[PDB]
């Protein structure tokens, strides 16, 4: 469909200032660019954007109360600097299914001191040598990776 | 002498095959590398071999 | 926006006038088309001279003005004039511009983000290019060519359609707001429209060009041309670069475009169903029609209905002809007598009776036509032009290239004309058993002799001997044919002429509406037979791929998988409108009433009994999760519901839901038992069979208000109901009324209640109650 209509539909007369969750999976965004988002969304604490033909995350406005994000099934690559300035209080992130080649693209995520879990599956980075260990050494604050902590400790449900 | 040289047109759609005994008959068609390696020995050739 | 307000102001100003008001008030909207012609009418005799003289000037073109200002296009770069403020007489909103101005824009000017959409707009020509690139040329040779003239197709095209089926498609992809009522072709071909719509959406484009290109993408260019060698569109599109009257550029082009495979598969299916219906004795007609409508097949990605493809193709075969006749499909004036092909050029006649004695004295009636008539005939790699006269083959000429084919064509022609003494006194070898009636169905002596020839070559030799033989006179040696099929001999057959060079196939752009009998023999406003079931191969076994024979008799599955499929079908049929159905309940979030449906109660016995509770738990869980929010996938509930009938329990779910026949389905991944795709969201594949889901509600995957149309219908107009758009149409309640605008200059009233019944059955059954 289109992120605009999807959003206007999810907003069943509700102001964009009292919601705590939003989902936009199985939609479309022209040029793989966000469309319809603003800083009006303040109380939002969760987001889900999956399989929407996205390619970059530059347009996303400033969201502080957000503490979980999902960007799987898209083809984003390179823009992880924007996440730090816009959402500094983020804890859970997911990127499985996107275009990720090296670690230099991941380095910015170190500044997300509030980060706990990260999900990278089906990406090229996973096909390297000493990838879990090197990542952990890069992002020490992190504890969970693709659902498994150091020593392969399966994470709980929630 | 082993199997003879082979000819071909530009697009390679056609290709003649010739034996060694007759390479002295088309020495004009062959490329300079093969040409400078064949004339000095034509003396020692009898039919298809080298004495 | 402000532009809208400007349009309103312009409309007001224009209505203030009297003539404009009279014309915009009188008549309907169609008058626009007429008005489109009385304006901007001007032509030229020799645009060539005019063009040269015109371009010679220093500002020869016209162009928009505001587009230039916005494009910051100046009037010079390093001293070359680019345009000048002025007004053309016709447009009044355009300004004269230089040829140098175009160059300026391309080299340095207003850049755009992307333009690969072009490859889709002109897909046919990029396909031409690719097909060319995948060729391996070969040597060139010189010689004479036997180029026969004939009607063929030059444009390879998939899913060839009609024109009425296109004028609609050009709208739902580009102009949906201005769309008309949904036609059947749309409701049937949903995924196709969705595909064509996914590419030309949210793009900056000129739409008229796209529509024109789509017309070309769906038009097989039919031409009457000289041809040599094989006949395939992949070749005819570049025949100009393969050979002429005196030269040939050899090249292999066999493995491209995969066209004729579809046609041969179609013809095989037609033969199969024709034989099946022939197995009957009194209803083969209705049996065949049922087999037709109860069948579908895949083309590339999409699934199409057989009866729809049959009415689009032009394969003149004794199988396709019968089908197209049953469905009342008109067709050309082309005959068929066994494997050969025939076409009448001139003449007339009428049926007449005669008899022959099979063995000793056994009278058997055989018919034959009266006055002289010409015919063209075409067998494998062989052509002929002959004439019949009162049960005799008057003359014949041939231009083939093979002896065997020549002889077979000659024999089949002699038969077609009942020429010879055999039709006067049949041979001893034939008997009453070989006569006719395998199981009661008679056989005219014609096809009898046909199979008698196909049986042994010596029958053919004797038949040829039945034709007069004489000594090859001088000079005619070249134009003579022996018994072996030699271009010359010392003694040759009677009234025969040979030559090198095929015959030019005739042509006629005519159509006829024929019928058929209960014995599968078509008639054309006369006692002539154009097709039958005796002119096709006897039988053969084939394994058809990507096909759907959704009919009991035409099925090989057992009662178990068939029961599963029928349960799924019944469970889907509850996807309509009205309370007690799943859509209303979903809207009301009554995820519980679904567990108590009767259909799940009928499919429950098929569930594995030792773990039915655990599966039930999981199913109910998923349902609530999907229903409570609103983010659901209709293709998963229809799959998991049959398990929610029993009571939950405790246990380890290991990923798969088994039935009682060691066949499972998995919730989230497609398998052999239940498959589907986001591309074609209107189909469900169970055990290979396909199922058409109605379009009543649209979940996350479905697209653009083309998935609600089977839930709406027309009703008596009510001015009280509100008028809304095509997007808010989803927020209505099942059973409500609403006014709406359709296409252009038309408003109606709709109601969100469906009607699954059609007119076929109602017309067919009601007409059967009148012949009594």
From Swiss-Prot, chain B:
It is found in: Host nucleus; Host cytoplasm. Phosphorylated by host PRKCA. Influenza RNA polymerase is composed of three subunits: PB1, PB2 and PA. Interacts (via N-terminus) with PA (via C-terminus). Interacts (via C-terminus) with PB2 (via N-terminus); this interaction is essential for transcription initiation. Belongs to the influenza viruses polymerase PB1 family. RNA-dependent RNA polymerase which is responsible for replication and transcription of virus RNA segments. The transcription of viral mRNAs occurs by a unique mechanism called cap-snatching. 5' methylated caps of cellular mRNAs are cleaved after 10-13 nucleotides by PA. In turn, these short capped RNAs are used as primers by PB1 for transcription of viral mRNAs. During virus replication, PB1 initiates RNA synthesis and copy vRNA into complementary RNA (cRNA) which in turn serves as a template for the production of more vRNAs. This is RNA-directed RNA polymerase catalytic subunit. The chain holds residues 353 to 403 of 754 of the full protein.
UniProtKB/Swiss-Prot annotation, chain C:
GO terms for molecular function: RNA binding; RNA-directed RNA polymerase activity. The keyword DNA-binding does not apply. This is Polymerase basic protein 2. InterPro entries: Flu_PB2_2nd, Flu_PB2_6th, Flu_PB2_C, Flu_PB2_CAP-bd, Flu_PB2_middle, Flu_PB2_N, INV_PB2, PB2_helical. It comes from the Viruses. Influenza RNA polymerase is composed of three subunits: PB1, PB2 and PA. Interacts (via N-terminus) with PB1 (via C-terminus). Interacts with nucleoprotein NP (via N-terminus). Interacts with host ANP32A (via C-terminus); this interaction promotes viral RNA synthesis. GO terms for biological process: 7-methylguanosine mRNA capping; cap snatching; DNA-templated transcription; symbiont-mediated suppression of host gene expression; symbiont-mediated suppression of host mRNA transcription via inhibition of RNA polymerase II activity; viral RNA genome replication. GO terms for cellular component: host cell nucleus; virion component. HAMAP family: INV_PB2. Plays an essential role in transcription initiation and cap-stealing mechanism, in which cellular capped pre-mRNAs are used to generate primers for viral transcription. Recognizes and binds a wide range of cap structures of target pre-RNAs which are subsequently cleaved after 10-13 nucleotides by the viral protein PA. Plays a role in the initiation of the viral genome replication and modulates the activity of the ribonucleoprotein (RNP) complex. Keywords: Cap snatching, Eukaryotic host gene expression shutoff by virus, Eukaryotic host transcription shutoff by virus, Host gene expression shutoff by virus, Host nucleus, Host-virus interaction, Inhibition of host RNA polymerase II by virus, mRNA capping, mRNA processing, Viral transcription, Virion. It is found in: Virion; Host nucleus. Belongs to the influenza viruses PB2 family. It holds the Pfam family Flu_PB2_2nd.
């Amino acid at each position: 469909m289109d992120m605009k209509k999807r959003i206007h539909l999810e907003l069943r007369n509700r102001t964009p200032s009292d919601v705590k969750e939003l989902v936009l999976d199985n939609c479309r965004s022209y040029e793989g660019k966000i469309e319809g988002l603003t800083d009006e969304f303040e109380e939002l604490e969760f987001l889900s954007t999956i399989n929407v033909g996205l390619a970059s995350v530059a347009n996303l406005p400033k969201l502080n109360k957000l503490k979980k994000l999902e960007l799987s099934d898209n083809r984003v690559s390179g823009g992880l600097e924007v996440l730090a300035e816009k959402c500094p209080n983020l804890t859970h992130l997911n990127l499985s299914g996107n275009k990720i080649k090296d670690l230099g693209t991941i380095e910015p995520l170190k500044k997300l001191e509030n980060l706990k879990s990260l999900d990278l599956f089906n990406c090229e980075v996973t096909n390297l040598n000493d990838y879990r260990e090197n990542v952990f050494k890069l992002l020490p604050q992190l504890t969970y990776l693709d659902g498994y902590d150091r020593d392969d400790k399966e994470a709980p449900d929630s | 002498l082993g199997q003879g040289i082979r000819l071909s047109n530009k697009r390679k759609t056609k290709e003649v095959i010739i034996k060694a005994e007759k390479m002295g008959k088309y020495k004009n068609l062959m490329r300079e590398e093969y040409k400078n390696l064949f004339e000095p020995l034509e003396k020692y050739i009898q039919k298809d071999v080298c004495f | 926006m402000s532009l809208l307000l400007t349009i309103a102001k312009e409309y007001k100003r224009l209505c203030q006038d009297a003539k404009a008001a009279q014309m915009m008030t009188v008549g309907t909207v169609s008058n626009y088309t007429t008005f489109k012609k009385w304006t901007t009418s001007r032509k030229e005799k020799n645009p060539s001279l005019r063009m040269r003289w015109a371009m010679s000037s220093k500002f020869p073109i016209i162009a928009n003005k505001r587009m230039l200002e916005e494009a910051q296009i100046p009037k010079e770069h390093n001293n070359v004039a680019l345009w000048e403020d002025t007004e053309d007489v016709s447009k009044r909103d355009h300004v004269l511009a230089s040829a140098s101005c175009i160059n300026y824009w391309n080299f340095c000017g207003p850049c755009v983000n992307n333009s690969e959409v072009i490859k889709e707009v002109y897909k046919s020509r990029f396909g031409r290019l690719e097909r060319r690139k995948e060729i391996m040329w070969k040597e060139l040779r010189f010689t004479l060519v036997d180029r026969q003239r004939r009607r063929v197709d030059t444009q390879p095209v998939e899913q060839r359609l009609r024109t009425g089926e296109i004028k609609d498609l050009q709208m739902w992809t580009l102009f949906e707001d201005e769309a008309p009522l949904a036609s059947k072709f749309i409701l049937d071909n949903y995924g196709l429209v969705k595909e064509m719509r996914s590419k030309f959406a949210n793009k900056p484009l000129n739409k008229e060009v796209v529509a024109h290109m789509l017309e070309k993408q769906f038009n097989p260019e039919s031409r009457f041309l000289p041809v040599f060698g094989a006949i395939r569109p992949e070749r005819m599109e570049l025949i100009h670069a393969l050979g002429g009257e005196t030269w040939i550029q050899e090249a292999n082009t066999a493995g491209i475009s995969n066209v004729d495979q579809r046609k041969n598969d179609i013809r095989a299916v037609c033969r199969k169903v024709c034989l099946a219906a022939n197995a009957s004795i009194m209803n083969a007609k209705s049996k065949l029609v049922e087999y037709i409508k109860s069948t579908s097949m895949r083309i590339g990605e999409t699934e199409r209905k057989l009866e729809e493809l049959i009415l689009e193709t032009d394969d003149v075969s004794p199988e396709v002809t019968l089908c197209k006749s049953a469905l009342g499909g008109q067709l050309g004036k082309t005959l068929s007598f066994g494997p050969m092909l025939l076409k009448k050029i001139s003449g007339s006649g009428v049926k007449v009776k005669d008899t022959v004695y099979i063995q000793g004295v056994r009278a058997v009636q055989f018919e034959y036509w009266s006055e002289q008539e010409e015919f063209y005939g075409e067998y494998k790699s062989a052509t002929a032009l002959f004439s019949r006269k009162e049960r005799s083959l008057e003359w014949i000429t041939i231009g083939g290239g093979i002896n065997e084919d020549r002889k077979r064509l000659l024999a089949m022609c002699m038969i077609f004309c009942r020429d010879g003494d055999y039709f006067k006194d049949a041979p001893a070898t034939i008997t009453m058993a070989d006569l006719s009636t395998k199981l009661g169905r008679e056989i005219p002596y014609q096809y009898v002799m046909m199979n008698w020839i196909q049986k042994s070559e010596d029958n053919l030799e004797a038949l040829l001997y039945s034709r007069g033989i004489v000594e090859t006179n001088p000079g005619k040696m070249g134009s003579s044919m022996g018994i072996d099929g030699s271009k010359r001999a010392i003694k040759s057959l009677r009234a025969v002429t040979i030559q090198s060079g095929k015959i030019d196939m005739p042509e006629s752009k005519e159509k006829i509406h024929l019928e058929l009998s209960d014995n599968l023999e078509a008639f054309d406003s006369s006692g002539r037979i154009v097709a039958t079931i005796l002119d096709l191969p006897s039988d053969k076994k084939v394994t058809f791929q990507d096909v759907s024979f959704q009919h009991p008799d035409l099925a090989v599955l057992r009662d178990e998988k068939t029961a599963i499929t029928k349960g799924y079908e019944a469970l889907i049929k509850r996807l309509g409108t009205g309370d007690n159905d799943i859509p209303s309940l979903i809207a009301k979030k009554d995820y519980l009433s679904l567990y108590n449906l009767p259909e799940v109660k009928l499919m429950a016995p098929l569930i594995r009994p030792n773990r039915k509770g655990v599966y039930s738990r999981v199913a109910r869980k998923l349902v609530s999760t999907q229903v409570t929010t609103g983010h659901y996938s209709l293709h998963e509930l229809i799959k998991v519901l049959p398990f929610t009938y029993f009571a939950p329990k405790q246990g380890m779910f290991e990923g798969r839901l088994f039935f009682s026949n060691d066949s499972f389905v998995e919730p989230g991944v497609n398998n052999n038992v239940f498959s589907w795709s986001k591309a074609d969201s209107s189909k469900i594949y169970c055990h290979g069979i396909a199922i058409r889901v109605p379009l009543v509600v649209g979940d996350e995957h479905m697209d653009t208000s083309l998935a609600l149309l089977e839930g709406f219908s027309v009703c008596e107009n009510d001015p009280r109901a509100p008028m809304v758009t095509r997007q808010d149409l989803i927020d209505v309640g099942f059973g409500q009324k609403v006014r709406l605008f359709v296409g252009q200059g038309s408003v109606r009233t709709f109601k969100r209640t469906a009607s699954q019944r059609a007119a076929s059955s109602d017309v067919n059954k009601n007409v059967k109650k009148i012949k009594m």
